[PDB]
Assembly symmetry: C3
Homo-oligomer: 320 residues x 3
Amino acid sequence: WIFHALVFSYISFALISDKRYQKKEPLISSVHTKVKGIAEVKAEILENGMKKMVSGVFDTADYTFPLQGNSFFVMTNFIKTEGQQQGLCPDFPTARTICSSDRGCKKGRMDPQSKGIQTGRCVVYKERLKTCEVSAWCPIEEVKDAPRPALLNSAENFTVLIKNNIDFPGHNYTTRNILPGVNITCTFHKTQNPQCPIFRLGDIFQETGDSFSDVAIQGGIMGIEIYWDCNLDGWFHHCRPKYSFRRLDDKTTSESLYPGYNFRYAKYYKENNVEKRTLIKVFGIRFDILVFGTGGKFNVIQLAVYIGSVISYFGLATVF
Amino acid sequence: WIFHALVFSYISFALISDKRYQKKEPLISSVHTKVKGIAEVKAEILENGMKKMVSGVFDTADYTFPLQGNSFFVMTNFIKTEGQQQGLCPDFPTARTICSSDRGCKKGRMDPQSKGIQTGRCVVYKERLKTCEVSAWCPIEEVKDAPRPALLNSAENFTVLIKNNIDFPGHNYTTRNILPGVNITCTFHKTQNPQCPIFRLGDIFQETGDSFSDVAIQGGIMGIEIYWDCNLDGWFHHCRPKYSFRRLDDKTTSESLYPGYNFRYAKYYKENNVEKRTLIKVFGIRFDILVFGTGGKFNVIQLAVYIGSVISYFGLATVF
Amino acid sequence: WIFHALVFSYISFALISDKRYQKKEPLISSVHTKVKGIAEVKAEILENGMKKMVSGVFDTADYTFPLQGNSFFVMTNFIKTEGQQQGLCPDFPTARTICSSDRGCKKGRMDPQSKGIQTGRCVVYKERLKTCEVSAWCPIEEVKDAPRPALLNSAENFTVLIKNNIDFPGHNYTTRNILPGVNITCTFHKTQNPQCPIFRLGDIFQETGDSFSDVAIQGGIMGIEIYWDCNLDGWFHHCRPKYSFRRLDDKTTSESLYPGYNFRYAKYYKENNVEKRTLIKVFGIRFDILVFGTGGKFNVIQLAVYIGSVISYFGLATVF
Ligand SMILES: C[C@@H]1c2nnn(-c3ncc(F)cn3)c2CCN1C(=O)c1cccc(C(F)(F)F)c1Cl
Ligand SMILES: C[C@@H]1c2nnn(-c3ncc(F)cn3)c2CCN1C(=O)c1cccc(C(F)(F)F)c1Cl
Ligand SMILES: C[C@@H]1c2nnn(-c3ncc(F)cn3)c2CCN1C(=O)c1cccc(C(F)(F)F)c1Cl
Ligand SMILES: *[C@@H]1O[C@H](CO)[C@@H](O)[C@H](O)[C@H]1NC(C)=O
Ligand SMILES: *[C@@H]1O[C@H](CO)[C@@H](O)[C@H](O)[C@H]1NC(C)=O
Ligand SMILES: *[C@@H]1O[C@H](CO)[C@@H](O)[C@H](O)[C@H]1NC(C)=O
Ligand SMILES: *[C@@H]1O[C@H](CO)[C@@H](O)[C@H](O)[C@H]1NC(C)=O
Ligand SMILES: *[C@@H]1O[C@H](CO)[C@@H](O)[C@H](O)[C@H]1NC(C)=O
Ligand SMILES: *[C@@H]1O[C@H](CO)[C@@H](O)[C@H](O)[C@H]1NC(C)=O
C-alpha cells in the first residue's frame, strides 16, 4: 500500500514541476534599440603603396543603421576606394589574373575572384608586370587585409538600450521589458544588475568569451537572447526576462567560406560631368536579438486530461 | 446513472470545443506591403534663431523605405542641418557643457549628451557666452523640439495595401490574404469591410485609440496583428484572417528613455573640394506586421490518445 | 486474445512513429548570406521618344543590399529618370489627367494615379495636347512598361551561399548549416548534392517551376525553406537540413493589385546650387529564407503520460 502513496506523490511532483495544469502559448515580440557612443578614429594606413592618415570623429549617424528585423549593425572597420569610374583597366596581380601574353586569358571569361569582365589584352600594370585588362569600375580595388589595429576599436565602449514589448495573443496579457519606476542609469551585470537593459558591447563580448578587438578586426555575428518564462496565474504571477549572449558566427577561418562579417557599400556621385563611385568595404559586428519564450495560464481542460491520463496509471500501479 | 450521461456530455463538449481530435501546426508567413499617398508640406520653422520656410511635395520615394523584416517606416517629421564638416567648434550652451574658464572642462572628456570629443578650451559662442569647444561635425546640431504642427500631418491620409501569404509546412496547405475575385477598392472597416486589406493610417490610429497628430509629432510604433484561425478539415474548412491594431510604443514620456521613435540620417557629399555631411533628425511611425496563427487537421493518433486518456476518467466517474 | 496483441502492436506503432516519448521544442535560427556574380548590361531603350544606350558592368555592390530580416534582394531591371526638381509641370497624358480647358480639373485635387498636387491650369504638353499642370518633381516620370529583354538577365547566373545557425534553447544543442570538413565548391542539386548550401538562382527557378526571364521582367518574391527535423537522442542522433523552394508571389497579373515586386529609389544631390533628385524604378526578385523545424529529446514525463493515456485504452480493448 506504500506504493499507492509513492505513485500519488510522483503524480503530484509531476503536476507541480511540469505545470501540466496550464495551457502554454507562444510569444509575440517587438524590439526597439538605441545605440550611443562616439569614436575618435586616428590611424595611418597604406593605400596603393602610399602612406595615408585617417582622422575623424564618428557619431551615431556614422557607424550604424536603424534596427530592421530584430537586428542592428555596428560598423568597426573600413577600407575606402574613391574615384572609380566605368572603363577598361588591368586586374590586380594574382596567380589567376597574371599573363605573359594576350593568349593567357580569353575575352569574356568570368572569374569568381575578379570583379570585371575580361577582354583578353595583357597590358603592363606596374614595373614590367603584365595582367590582362578587364572592363569594370576603375581603378580595381586593392586586395588587402583589414588594418591590424581596428579603426573603430573604441566601439567596444558603446552602449545599447533595448526595449522589448511582448504579447500573448491567446490570453489578455501584454507587457514590456522596462517596468515603470526603474533606474535608467545602468551597466548590465550578471549578478549586480540583471534586469536593466543597458548593455555594453565590451561587456557582452566578455561574458560570451571572445575578445572584442579580434572580432572587430574582421567583423562577426553575435546574438542577445531574451528569454521570457512567464506564469500568468493570479496566485503565482511572474513575467520577467532573462538575458544571455551567444556568438552566432561560424568562426570558419577559411578564405573559401568568407570568414567574419563584411560587405561592400557604394556611394555614387558626379564629378566634372562624369559619373563616379566610391566603394567602402565595411567590416562590422551584427547583433541579433532572438526573443523567445512562452506563457502558461490555468486551464480546466488540460487538468482534466492530465488527471484522466494519470488515473489509469495509478490504478494499474495499485493493481500490480 | 445520470452522471454517466453527464460525464459523456461534458466529454463531447470538450472534444468539440477544444478540437482535441486535431493536430495543430504553426504558421509560416510572408508579407508584402505597398504604401501610397503624397503630402504637400508648407510650414515655417525657426533655425538658429532665423525664420525659414519649408515648402515641397513628398511622394512615395520621399518618406518611406521598402519593407524589411515584416515592418515598414512612414516619415512624419524632420529637422535638417546642412553644411557640417569635421573640425573644432564650440558645443551648444548647456548646463553640462557650460564653462567660465578653460578649467571648467578637461581635454578628451566624453559626455553622453554631447556629440563631440572635448578638447578643453572655453571659447565664446555668442553674445558673451562661453562654452568649451569639441572636435566633431560643425556646426553642432541645435537640440530643439519637433515643430508643433507636424510637418507630414497629411500622412494620416496615406493608404497601405498588405498582401500576406501563409503556409503550413506539415500539411499540404498554403493560401494568401487576398482571395481571387475580390474588390480592390476598399477602406478597412471593423464591420462594413473586415476582409479587404487596404488600411488607412488615420483609421488605424482611430481604432487603436490615439490621435495621429500627437503621435506623429514625436513618432511611435504600432503593430497590425493578422490572426489566422484555420480549420483545414474537408467537412468544415475555413481559413481567413482577422485584423487588429495595437500600439507597441512604450509611451515613456521621460527624456531619459528617448520617448517616441526617431533616428538620425546622414547624407555625405563634396562641395568646393571639401567633404561635407547633412544630418536629418527623422521622427516617424514604425508599423510592425505581427502575423500569427495555427492550423488544425484531423489526426487519428490524437483522437485515440484523447479517447484513451478520458476513458479512465469516465470509468472512475461511473465507479465513484 | 489476438486483439490483446493487436492493440499492443498498434501501441508500439504509435509510440515509435509519432515519437510520443520525446519532448519536442521549436527552433531559433540565424541566417547569413553572400551573393556573388557580375552582370554585363548592354541594351537599347526608348526614353521620352528618344533612343538611348545603357552599357556597364554591375558587381555585387550595384544590384543588392546586405541581408536584413532573413531576406535579400537582387535587382533585375531598372528605369532611370534624372534631373528632377521641385516645381510646376504638366502631368503625363492620361484619360484621368486630360483636359480641354482649365475647368477640366480643379486645384488641390489628389488623384491616386498621379504623383503631383493639382493646381488647375490646363497647359499644352506636346503637339497640341493639353493637360492640367501639377506641383511636384519635374519632369514627371514617363509611364512606361519595363524593357522587354530584362536588363540584368545574367542575374540568373549568380550564386548565393547561405549559412544557417540553429539553436534549441531548452536543450543544450546548437548547430550550423555547414559542418566542418565539407566541400565548398558546389552547385545545389536535388539528388546529386543535397547538402551543400551554394544555390544558383536559375536552378532555384528551374526546380520551383517558373522561368527566370519572365519573373525578372517584372520582379517577384521567392522563398527558400530550410527544414530541420532533428532527433537529439544519443542512440539515434541526426540533425540535418532539407532545402525546398516555393514562389511566394501572388501572380495577380492585375494592374490594380500591382503585380510583381518593384519599388522606387531616390538619390538627392545638388547641381548649379539647385537641389535635384534622380528616381530609379527598380524591379527585382525578393528571396525569403523561411527556416523552420523542431527538435525532440527523450523525456520520462511524456513517456509516462502517454503510457497512462493508453493503459485505459488497451484495458477497455481487453474488456470489450
Ligand atoms: C561617407 C562615409 C560612409 N558612407 N557610408 N557609411 C556607412 N557605412 C556603414 C554604416 F553602418 C553607416 N554608414 C559611411 C561612414 C562614414 N563616411 C565618411 O566619409 C566619414 C565620416 C566621418 C569621418 C570620416 C573620417 F574619419 F574618415 F574622416 C569619414 Cl571617412
Ligand atoms: C534629401 C532629403 C532626404 N534624405 N533622406 N530622406 C529620407 N528620410 C527618411 C526616409 F524614410 C526616406 N528618405 C530624405 C527626405 C527628403 N529630402 C529632401 O531634401 C526633400 C525632398 C522633397 C521635398 C523637400 C522639401 F519639401 F523640403 F522641399 C525636401 Cl527638403
Ligand atoms: C547609381 C545607380 C543606383 N542607385 N541605387 N542603386 C541600387 N539600386 C538597387 C539596389 F539593390 C542597389 N543599388 C543603383 C544601381 C546602379 N547605379 C548606376 O548609376 C550604375 C552603376 C553601374 C553601371 C551603370 C550603367 F550600366 F548603367 F552604366 C549604372 Cl547606371
Ligand atoms: C573605453 O573606455 C575606458 C574608460 O571608460 C578607456 O580606459 C578605454 O581606453 C576605452 N577603450 C578604448 C578602446 O579606448
Ligand atoms: C538608482 O540607483 C542609485 C544608485 O545607483 C540610487 O541611489 C537610486 O535610488 C536608484 N533609483 C533612482 C530612481 O535613481
Ligand atoms: C485628409 O483628407 C481629407 C479629405 O479626404 C481632408 O479633409 C483632410 O484635411 C486631410 N488631412 C489633412 C491632414 O489635411
Ligand atoms: C465592388 O464594390 C462595388 C460597390 O462598392 C460593387 O458595385 C461591385 O460589384 C463590387 N465588386 C467589383 C468586382 O467591383
Ligand atoms: C549563364 O552562363 C552560361 C554559361 O555558364 C551561359 O551560357 C549563359 O548565356 C549565361 N546566361 C546569360 C543570361 O547570359
Ligand atoms: C570535393 O569534390 C571533389 C570532386 O567534386 C573531390 O575530388 C574532393 O575530394 C571533394 N572534397 C574536397 C575537400 O575537395
